[PDB]
Structure formats: structure tokens, C-alpha cells
Design a protein around this nucleic acid. Structure first.
Ligand code: MG
Ligand code: MG
Ligand code: MG
Ligand code: MG
Ligand code: MG
Ligand code: MG
Ligand code: MG
Ligand code: MG
Ligand code: MG
Ligand code: MG
Ligand code: MG
Ligand code: MG
Ligand code: MG
Ligand code: MG
Ligand code: MG
Ligand code: MG
Ligand code: MG
Ligand code: MG
Ligand code: MG
Ligand code: MG
Ligand code: MG
Ligand code: MG
Ligand code: MG
Ligand code: MG
Ligand code: MG
Ligand code: MG
Ligand code: MG
Lengths: 128, 147, 52
RNA sequence: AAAAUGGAUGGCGCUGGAGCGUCGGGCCCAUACCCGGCCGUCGCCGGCAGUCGAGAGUGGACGGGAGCGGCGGGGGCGGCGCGCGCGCGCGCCCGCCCCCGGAGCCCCGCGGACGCUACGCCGCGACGAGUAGGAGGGCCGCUGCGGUGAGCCUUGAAGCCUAGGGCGCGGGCCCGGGUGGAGCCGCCGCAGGUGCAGAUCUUGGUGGUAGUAGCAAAUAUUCAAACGAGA
RNA sequence: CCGACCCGUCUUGAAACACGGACCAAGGAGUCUAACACGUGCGCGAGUCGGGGGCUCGCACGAAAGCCGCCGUGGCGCAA
RNA sequence: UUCAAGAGGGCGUGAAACCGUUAAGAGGUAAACGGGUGGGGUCCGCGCAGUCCGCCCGGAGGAUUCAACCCGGCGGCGGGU
């Protein structure tokens, strides 16, 4: 049924959570987005035990599977049929995703053709 | 281009590149070239020697047009004229010996830096130098003065 | 406060140089005014030479 | 050999030690050391525009005489060297001696990678602390100009909300659902009033305090009736 | 279950019985010119620069663009 | 009435702090925090089997044009005496 990709290697992610900014649990002016701390007396910087962890490059992800979905496919964003036909030959490695601003009456067209050319769509049932 | 600067890179960095123990305060040494005898004596004895003092006579109302003597050497002399000249000389063997005015091409005095090829040239100029006069007669030419 | 081996300079800005700045933004209009005056004179003195 | 809040071999507590001294076998565990995997940087005068191999300067086009040998040389065990070819096969010693527009399996000197955006792809080996500070890369972002997407759109733009699905080390982003009512974005270059936690920061708004402190200077009010929804 | 004292800043040294800070949204702080030194990139080359002015467009662009016996008056350089 | 009053005279949209209510969950070392697992709910996709797909060879079934080779026209690549 569902279009099988070419290969399906297992995927491994060294960290799964996110990195929250420090002192963001107390307050609401402060957000969850990472900003690096730079004070002198600070202990995330100085790396004590039992504290926030800072992102380095060792958490970095393998390159055979980077920007790779759980289904083996990598993603690509479109707005019309014309830029869809460029995926005909990479129809087993990459997939399509239709933008948010397209009208209902035109989504039907794009789906109708992707199904012909065997180009998988990661949101085929949105507006209806 | 603001986007190629290093103020676009010191955001987050608390001090904008100027320290914490010492700070970018206003004018902490003076203001200008102050202190050549006091607390900058060393830059001006070292990198600028001859600055303090007084020397020489005074000329009060000096006009730089009286004192004007554009100079030229001998190597750069056959270029005032074209190539017809230097080639049609050393040819037909009459004692051609062409004439070269320097005051036409914007030069007054003649100087003896270089050398020059063997043809019996004539020259006209206001001033000469000793060695320049020699080299010319050495090649078989002459020198001529004008007002 | 000087530093390692530069020039010594004396700039002339210790006055109030800033009320008295002059822009050359009217450079073209100044050109355009003249032509229309320079033409019209030569039309006033009709066959006579325009230069003078 | 004596101090003032009740009081500290860390504590409970221990006297064939859980004490003091000399000594054994067994054992425990650090981001240190070893083995492996994944990321980045650095170094190879690295490698690939299309053909040869792991010991020491290789290749053919080229004439007159032709084989059983070569390579008649170190108990050294030497880059040189010797039995996985040395003259193999087919017609009749003599001759042929097409041969990869494709031999035959790991070198093909005819042209080429599924790789070749050369600002690319591949391979090895070593390293990674960090304040002030210095440099680089930013397909991280904000507003506008020039070109360009035969771009998006009242069959619904911006903005806003979200126990929803997902990506990137991170900056940040893409989808899905609701509201809403008219404009907005991606690429190559240009430009800048360009990214906030603070500054007894400026302007506006809102909380605990809190239904609290209080409504106490100057002797004093009471009974009935009337208007009136109502004293 | 184990670990774990509140951020900024001065400081040899801060969890401090050292100052600032109730809470939220918006604004908010390394600029522009003039001159110099060096490094990089482009063009011509013992030469190289029209920036002032003039000839052509009424200026929709565009107060642009092109051009000059000005073509070098001159400035920096080639000689101390 | 108006498409719309979830546009009702300081009425475009309509954030946050701060409040009221409803649903769930919990409660003697102030709260909050990091790593690791568990439990429960809200939603996504199963499928109410998910048995995934593609090349050549073999087999049994049916079916209709051409190609194999010739001739005619048309177009293009290459060549060097
Ligand atoms: Mg992640
Ligand atoms: Mg410190
Ligand atoms: Mg720093
Ligand atoms: Mg600095
Ligand atoms: Mg400071
Ligand atoms: Mg000091
Ligand atoms: Mg300097
Ligand atoms: Mg480091
Ligand atoms: Mg409108
Ligand atoms: Mg602006
Ligand atoms: Mg600003
Ligand atoms: Mg703020
Ligand atoms: Mg700060
Ligand atoms: Mg009371
Ligand atoms: Mg009273
Ligand atoms: Mg210090
Ligand atoms: Mg002190
Ligand atoms: Mg502190
Ligand atoms: Mg104390
Ligand atoms: Mg103070
Ligand atoms: Mg205070
Ligand atoms: Mg702001
Ligand atoms: Mg330069
Ligand atoms: Mg409406
Ligand atoms: Mg409305
Ligand atoms: Mg309203
Ligand atoms: Mg609520």
C-alpha cells in the first residue's frame, strides 16, 4: 500500500530532549529558547553536577540520516505542480509537502498527479 | 556595510570588546597630542625625533614661483622627441645633430644621472650640471644656453 | 593618547564647524539655470557672437 | 587539664573492637587508562578530468642473425631474482601469431563513477578544558531597494492561540486544527534608526498586602404622622 | 532513586549578614563625517586621476547616463 | 437587521501579566530544577492482516497489431582519398 522507500536503516539520536534556557522555569519574560549564559559566578557555564546541559557538537547526528523522517524519506516544500515534476527521479529518497497558503481547489490537482508519478505526499488530507 | 562589522558579533557579549577591569571611559590620557614632555615623552623621543625646538632662518613673504626648476636626466631625454628623429639621425652622414628644447616640454635644468647612445645631439636649456656637460661632449655633441 | 608609530596630526575642528556646512546638492540646477540664461542672451544679441 | 543558647572521631554507636602498631589475600569505584561506534577541527606538497599495486628509476614504434636458456655471482640467509609458464595453442621444424565496439575475472595504455554543484566527492591518521580578548562560518533572524519565481491568495493574506505531527548540536523552522477579514513570501545581489532580563532605566497596566489600617477634637437625641416603589 | 544554595556585577575571594531586582507588554545603549597607517580586491601603468566647468534631454525613470584641442591649469609621483 | 453583532455607539483584530468557572490529577521536611524509568490520560496511524514491491526464467489460459526481412520517402551523425 504505502510507498516503500529504497532503504530503511535504523535511526539513532544521542539526545532526544530539548535544551531549555536557564531560569526559565521561574519566570515568563524568559523563554525556552537557548541563549548562552555569560556571567562570572554562573554554574552552568562552570559545569557543576545536576544542572542544565549545554549543546556542543558531540550530540551531532550521523550524516547518512540527517533531516531524515521516521519513514526514511527526506522532505521538500512546494507551491504548484511545476516544481513537483523535479522530483520524478528522486521518488524513493525524498518526499513532498504542500505549503499552508495553497487553496483547496488546487490541492486536489497536485495530489491527483503525485499519485500518478509515485511521489509520496506527507499531508494528503488537509482541507477537503 | 553594517552587516560586515564586529558590532554585529558582540551582541550578548557584555562589554562590547573593551574589558571589565578597565573600561572605555572618556579621555583617559589627555585629549590630542598632549604630553610630549610629560607622560608621553617616550613615543616622541622614539618615533618622532626632531619635534621640539627651533632651527633655521626665516623668510617672511615667500613666493614659490621664483624658486622653480624642474629637472630631468639624460636617459629620459630622447623621449621628448619622436622616433623619426633618432632614426633619421645616424643616417645620410651630413653631421645632422638635431636640436632638443627642454623648455618646450616643461623642463629647465639638465642632470647627468644616466648614459646615452652615440649620436652627436645638440641641447638647449637654461641651466646645466658639470657631469652632464661632460657626457655630451664625450659623445660628440654640444650645449647651448638660453634666457 | 597615541600608539605605535603613526603620524602626528592637527585637525581644525575645535570651533563650531557644524552650523556652517555647505551642501553641493544644487549643483545640477545651477548648471541648468545657466544654459537657459546663456542661450537667451545669444538670442537677445541675435547675429552678434555669443562669447562676446 | 576551668566558661558562659543544648552538642558533636561526620552520626548511631563500638571494648575476643567498628580502638592502637606491624602485615596479608579478596573486593569497591573517577569525565584517568585500553577496545569499539558516532561528531567536528587539524595534517598528508593527500587522491579523483578517468587505469595499476604495494621491497627500491619504467615504456614502446623501430633493423640484420635466433633459442634451452635465462640470472654459470653470499651457510649470506639481502632491494637481485629464481620453477604458477620458458617454446602455450592451431594448421602443415615451417608458417599463422583476428582478438577485448568487448576478454574474462580483479588490469584491460578505445572511455566512462550510480561521485564530476571541482566553492565538489572520497580516504587515512592524530586531537577536543576555558575567563578578558582575537578570528571565522552562519540555508539563524528584522525592515526596505534592484532583478527573478509565466510564485501564493475572498474555494480565504498578515497576525494570534494550540494535551496535535516532525526537523536541526543550536540559533530557528515546516505541517495539522480554531479565530480573522486583504494582502504576502522564496532565491542572487544592495542598504541599515537591525535581535534585551537587568541600567534606584522611560511610558502604560496589574497583583500580594487587604475586605485589612481606618470613617473617635468641640455634652444629645426620642415618639408619631405625610409625600413616596423605597426612610 | 541519586544529584542539586538566586541571576547580574565589582572583586585575591560571593549562597552571602555586599548593592540592584514585586509582576507583564512596548521602547532602549558602540554611530556619521574629516584625516592618517597597514592588509585585501579591481583597473591603467612611468605615469595615473576630471572631483570644478562645458556639449548633448524636454529631465516620466534620472536631480541619472554619455562625451571634451578642456585631456591635464593642477595634485600625488618620477631626485636628493 | 446584516455574510457577520463570537462588528451593538471610546463598537477593526484582540497578547501577556492578574482573575471566575469547568475537566483531570496530587498534597505533613516552602516551591521549583537535572538524569533515569514507571503509571495514567489526550491525540496520530493500525488494519477492525500489515503481510511490502520490483526484474528475468518455467507453466497453464485466453487476445489483438506489429516487428524479422524487403521496398518507398523524410530527417539526422560521422568521414576523409
Ligand atoms: Mg532535537
Ligand atoms: Mg570567579
Ligand atoms: Mg567572551
Ligand atoms: Mg577591543
Ligand atoms: Mg562594564
Ligand atoms: Mg585598575
Ligand atoms: Mg596604529
Ligand atoms: Mg575549546
Ligand atoms: Mg477591508
Ligand atoms: Mg530604517
Ligand atoms: Mg538600536
Ligand atoms: Mg523588558
Ligand atoms: Mg544581561
Ligand atoms: Mg475593622
Ligand atoms: Mg469626631
Ligand atoms: Mg578578577
Ligand atoms: Mg574586598
Ligand atoms: Mg554572585
Ligand atoms: Mg556572613
Ligand atoms: Mg556600589
Ligand atoms: Mg530593593
Ligand atoms: Mg522590544
Ligand atoms: Mg591598497
Ligand atoms: Mg467576521
Ligand atoms: Mg468584526
Ligand atoms: Mg473589538
Ligand atoms: Mg483557567
Amino acid at each position: 500500500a504505502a510507498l516503500r522507500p529504497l532503504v530503511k536503516p535504523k535511526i539513532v539520536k544521542k539526545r532526544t530532549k530539548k535544551f531549555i534556557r536557564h531560569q526559565s522555569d521561574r519566570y515568563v519574560k524568559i523563554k525556552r529558547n537557548w541563549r548562552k549564559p555569560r556571567g562570572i559566578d554562573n554554574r552552568v557555564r562552570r559545569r557543576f553536577k545536576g544542572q542544565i546541559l549545554m549543546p556542543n557538537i558531540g550530540y551531532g547526528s550521523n550524516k547518512k540520516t540527517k533531516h531524515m523522517l521516521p519513514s526514511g524519506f527526506r522532505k521538500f516544500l512546494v507551491h504548484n505542480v511545476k516544481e513537483l515534476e523535479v522530483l520524478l527521479m528522486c521518488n524513493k529518497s525524498y518526499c513532498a509537502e504542500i505549503a499552508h497558503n495553497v487553496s483547496s481547489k488546487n490541492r486536489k490537482a497536485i495530489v491527483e498527479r503525485a499519485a500518478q508519478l509515485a511521489i509520496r505526499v506527507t499531508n494528503p488530507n488537509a482541507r477537503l | 556595510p553594517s552587516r560586515l562589522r564586529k558590532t554585529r558579533k558582540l551582541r550578548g557579549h557584555v562589554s562590547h570588546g573593551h574589558g571589565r577591569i578597565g573600561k572605555h571611559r572618556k579621555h583617559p590620557g589627555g585629549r590630542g597630542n598632549a604630553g610630549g614632555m610629560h607622560h608621553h615623552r617616550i613615543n616622541f623621543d622614539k618615533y618622532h625625533p626632531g619635534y621640539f625646538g627651533k632651527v633655521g632662518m626665516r623668510h617672511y613673504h615667500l613666493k614659490r614661483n621664483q624658486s622653480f626648476c624642474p629637472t630631468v636626466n639624460l636617459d629620459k631625454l630622447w623621449t621628448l622627441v619622436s622616433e623619426q628623429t633618432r632614426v633619421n639621425a645616424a643616417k645620410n652622414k651630413t653631421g645632422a645633430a638635431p636640436i632638443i628644447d627642454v623648455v618646450r616640454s616643461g623642463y629647465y635644468k639638465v642632470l647627468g644621472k644616466g648614459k646615452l647612445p652615440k649620436q652627436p645631439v645638440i641641447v638647449k636649456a637654461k641651466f646645466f650640471s658639470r657631469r652632464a656637460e661632460e657626457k655630451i661632449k664625450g659623445v660628440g655633441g654640444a650645449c647651448v644656453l638660453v634666457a | 593618547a597615541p600608539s605605535r608609530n603613526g603620524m602626528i596630526l592637527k585637525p581644525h575642528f575645535h570651533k563650531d564647524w557644524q552650523r556652517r556646512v555647505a551642501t553641493w546638492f544644487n549643483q545640477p540646477a545651477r548648471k541648468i539655470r545657466r544654459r537657459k540664461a546663456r542661450q537667451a542672451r545669444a538670442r537677445r544679441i541675435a547675429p552678434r557672437p555669443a562669447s562676446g
